[PDB]
Ligand SMILES: Cc1ncc(COP(=O)(O)O)c(CN)c1O
Ligand SMILES: Cc1ncc(COP(=O)(O)O)c(CN)c1O
């Protein structure tokens with residue numbers, strides 16, 4: 001297994017960008033060693049700069065639900081770009097996408113496009129405050145909602161993977177309005193409310209966690225959150241940037257039946273291009289400029305290319321059998337990966353919901369971040385390298401959810417299991 | 428001059444999105460309130476959803492310097508999209524793009540790509556505060572540095588256009604670690620520093636403002652700023668998101684010989700695709716994850732399509748007589764406008780540096796925001812609507828700089844001055 005090309009390129013990159021990467025998660029810093037420079041990606045596969053081919057389970061971290069380089073998405077983008085990549089003015093495409101999103105998502109009645117998850121979460125942060133007139137916010141421990149200053153407290157994603165403290169650069173003055181708490185812990189929430197009357201604007205959370213491993217809400221936990229926030233005139237916000245259009249057409253809020261007041265979207269909505277969105281109840285959105293006082297600008301927000309990619313992407317998920325297939329194939333992978341773990345003598349656990357899954361090297365179960373932190377990070381490290389040299393690409397972290405697409409085949413699954421068997425037999 | 432389709436389309440939009448747009452300035456609120464919807468852009472022109480052709484001076488807010496729909500930029504993108512549009516792992520393109528940017532801009536010894544100028548603006552503040560260990564930041568009235576919390580106070584763009592105030596979702600707890608001074612007031616700055624010892628991280632500003640109208644730095648303004656920050660061990664940061672590559676290849680810092688410690692880029696570097704970047708001295712960039720403790724990530728960061736359109740744009744700008752041609756046409760146009768005003772009895776003033784200019788309905792001269800606010804916005808509103816009917820497209824705000832391209836011909840410059848005359852002979 002040669003990685004000479006990925007090696008030279010990565011070495012050069014370190015003298016050019018901080019740690020040779022455009023993002024901390026692309027760093028194999030915890031998973032032992034150096035990364036893989038990709039060359040191209042198509043369907044469920046990816047080819048590095050040395051020729052090795054892999055079956056992808058990362059999918060550019062989420063957008064790829066239809067599979068890489070999807071023919072219908074890439075031709076629609078071909079024709080579209082003949083008209084120019086950006087206007088800086090309205091274009092009918094915005095209406096078409098805005099319309100689709102309102103339909104797709106239950107809570108959403110009025111939308112605002114933006115350029116990424118980080119901008120959507122940051123905008124919804126502000127809006128929460130402006131709308132309620134309150135300063136404090138309740139975010140759970142291990143969750144990630146971008147790197148907006150106030151969210152840089154007890155974050156997951158790369159902060160966990162890298163083992164970093166909270167912040168460095170965000171004033172104490174602002175971090176103080178961020179009240180934290182263990183995921184799945186309803187009692188902690190209540191205690192925070194009764195102890196800070198008239199100050200809590202809302203609760204924000206990953207309806208199903210993906211940045212501290214994969215974690216599902218406890219039975220009743222979401223409903224409880226709808227129930228208590230209503231009682232204190234507080235806002236319930238679901239960061240569905242990563243679960244949006246993946247867990248279900250309308251997301252966790254549609255699947256599990258609970259409707260928030262504001263939701264954020266990203267990833268899959270771009271179709272592979274930079275796109276984010278935030279929206280919800282009409283009366284809350286009215287506070288956004290140029291309709292209301294809360295200002296939020298964007299030179300490239302709503303550009304035609306991003307709009308096109310997303311439109312097409314959504315038209316495909318809308319076809320029959322979409323979410324069934326995703327469930328079907330991801331169940332086999334999860335069950336099989338667990339089946340093998342037992343059969344080879346290793347403590348393990350995880351599960352899946354539609355096209356998203358997780359698998360930890362511990363007995364479990366995992367209900368929160370602290371539980372997640374008990375995984376044998378040393379074992380996962382040797383298991384990753386193993387899965388690698390066998391042609392399977394996984395999130396270089398024990399703290400990320402794995403993804404599955406409509407391009408993955410029953411055969412791709414089996415080939416994965418087979419390699420998982422081979423790898424675990426040593427360890 | 429019919430705008431039927433643009434009207435029904437914008438009308439429908441207001442039901443779907445806040446204000447019916449994606450960035451505030453597109454609502455046309457300052458110039459009558461009735462926007463036109465684009466269908467396509469090419470070379471130096473734009474086209475309505477009604478069939479009208481305009482000569483563009485907005486150029487998508489900066490990015491289209493080489494002209495709309497550049498043949499070489501789009502063919503290049505059509506070639507790269509067959510290899511997928513988003514990887515999630517490193518790619519050779521980031522290295523080549525990075526290397527080019529380090530070469531181009533003085534201050535930059537190490538860069539980090541992001542998805543927007545806003546993101547880069549969030550980031551540089553946090554980095555500057557983290558590096559020094561101080562929380563006070565100094566900013567100027569009318570300078571836009573991304574719709575973020577800490578900076579939504581007397582900002583530019585929509586703010587310095589439709590009179591947007593301070594805060595819009597940002598508490599007194601955010602906009603309190605930030606100080607303010609009138610752009611161009613060296614004394615106020617020395618004051619602020621003396622008035623606040625050992626607690627100012629640095630100064631961030633637009634080297635040339637385009638967000639409060641086009642405004643150039645006075646005599647030894649920048650030179651002064653560098654010398655004072657140096658003395659206090661404070662950082663000098665240049666938001667060159669607008670100026671970079673448009674004023675000069677190395678932006679304003681290269682043009683006026685002053686070198687800041689860090690700088691932010693955006694717009695042009697992505698060739699009309701969601702992109703941004705921030706870089707500066709090595710020793711400081713080290714603190715950025717994963718190389719350092721300060722967190723900042725981005726899913727779509729450093730993607731291939733954006734890196735591809737960035738490189739083709741920088742290649743075209745590196746050709747012979749690039750910035751020469753812009754200075755040449757932008758002067759003929761800037762002067763042409765100012766001449767027609769003197770001859771039609773309308774007081775006005777303006778100016779240009781390379782392919783960027785300004786034109787204010789007042790005798791000026793404009794040295795700051797207050798100065799900018801003595802403009803006759805009723806005349807502008809009317810003036811603007813006039814030009815729109817002659818087929819010339821201008822920034823729908825008196826506080827927004829105009830832009831020129833390498834596709835604008837001498838003849839397009841002549842015909843605008845023609846409209847400029849037929850129109851100014853009214854009002
Ligand atoms: C739940 C969630 N929200 C937001 C983000 C960050 O948004 P983006 O990277 O699109 O800026 C991520 C990134 N993996 C995420 O998973
Ligand atoms: C100087 C400056 N800084 C930051 C920004 C933010 O730009 P973007 O739309 O890329 O987030 C702008 C946008 N007009 C700008 O003019």
Ligand SMILES: Nc1cccc(C(=O)O)c1
Pocket residue numbers: 022023024025026060061157158515516724725726727728
């Ligand atoms: N999940 C996640 C979070 C942040 C960045 C990335 C990335 O690929 O650059 C992915």
